[PDB]
Design a protein around this ligand. Structure first.
Ligand code: NA
Length: 241
């Protein structure tokens, strides 16, 4: 409320004049170090834009994966921003923003086929040569959701991405991170982000439990950020999408 009674974390931040952002600095492309050992990445950029929305300075507080949750609970920083995946273990002890990225499996295809394979429907066709490694989630995704396609099983150390590029297969199913990396590093390949059933996880900003005020601010701000195209530019800049 305004005819209000209480001070919130959102007030503490405004009164102190700094947003303390917990981040690991060991995770490209979200949070890492440039050639000088300053913070760089996707969520370093976002962090700065959140501080600026608030009218405050950003202060980056080093944390590590092993102490992320206890640092957050011990009020070392106001928010964790650093490609944090939303996991049940993490939600037990923290609140998450709405998701700013979804991920899981991502098809990797030739560059000129990018527009051609953009849905499950486009991919699950009998002329489509699908490539996977044996024995894990890539193979199981294909057997489950791509039954009309011609699925070939390779081996884990084979360069399957290169089978796609050279035209010996059409679509490689792999984790998002790998798709994105092979597409960025090969001029002939493109990664196409598709929603369910391909996506199975999400990334969010992690906040201490019980302050709906800051969390609501963040969520309104994320949505504003989506709406004006800022996440698109970030995807482009950092994910080379
Ligand atoms: Na590429």
């Amino acid at each position: 409320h305004h005819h209000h009674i209480a001070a919130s974390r959102l007030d503490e931040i405004m009164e102190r004049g700094t947003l303390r952002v917990g981040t690991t600095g060991d995770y490209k492309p979200f949070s890492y170090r440039d050639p000088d050992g300053q913070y760089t990445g996707f969520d370093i950029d976002v962090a700065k834009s959140l501080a600026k929305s608030l009218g405050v300075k950003v202060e980056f507080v080093p944390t590590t994966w092993p102490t992320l949750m206890s640092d957050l609970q011990a009020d070392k920083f106001d928010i964790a921003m650093g490609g944090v995946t939303v996991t049940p273990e993490r939600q037990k002890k923290a609140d998450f923003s709405d998701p700013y990225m979804t991920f899981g499996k991502t098809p990797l295809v030739r560059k000129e086929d990018a527009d051609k394979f953009k849905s499950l429907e486009d991919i699950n066709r009998p002329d489509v040569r699908v490539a996977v490694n044996p024995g894990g989630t890539n193979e199981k995704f294909a057997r489950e959701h791509l039954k009309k396609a011609k699925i070939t099983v390779y081996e884990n150390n084979v360069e399957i991405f290169q089978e796609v590029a050279s035209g010996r297969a059409d679509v490689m199913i792999t984790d998002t991170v790998e798709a994105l990396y092979y597409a960025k590093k090969h001029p002939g390949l493109a990664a196409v982000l598709v929603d369910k059933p391909f996506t199975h996880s999400e990334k969010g900003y992690m906040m201490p439990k019980g302050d709906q005020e800051f969390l609501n601010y963040v969520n309104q701000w994320l949505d504003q950020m989506k709406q004006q195209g800022t996440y698109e530019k970030l995807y482009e800049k950092w994910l080379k999408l």
